[PDB]
Amino acid sequence: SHMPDSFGIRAKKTKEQLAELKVSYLKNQFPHDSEIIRLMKITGLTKGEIKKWFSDTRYNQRNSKSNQCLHLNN
């Protein structure tokens, strides 16, 4: 016990922290829990801010079409 804080009250994810989250989306669009803990280590974020971001990025993947996507797997 040395650092008593990792909890960003209404704190915005900086371009560096947010870009590490992008690396996790590019390797797999549905992140494994161990990879999310690794993001909390590098960035200094919470698992809540991370789970929030990937839900936004899943829609950001289909921004213009809004509802469906091209080359949809069936």
24 within 8 A of 39, measured Cβ to Cβ: yes
Half-sphere exposure of 69 (CA within 13 A, CB side): 10
Technique used to solve these coordinates = NMR
Domain map (residue ranges) of the chain:
1-74
> Using CA atoms, how far apart are residues 30 and 61, in angstroms rounded to an integer?
13
Half-sphere exposure of 29 (CA within 13 A, CB side): 8
Side chain identity, residue 42? I
Cβ neighbours of residue 20 under 8 Å, at least 6 residues apart?
Answer: 39, 42, 43
CA dist 34 to 10, 41, 47, Å?
Answer: 24, 11, 11
Domain 1-74, what fold?
Answer: Arc Repressor Mutant, subunit A (1.10.10)
DSSP state of 29: S
Q: Cα Rg for the chain, rounded, in angstroms? A: 14
CA 28, distance to chain mean position in Å, is 11
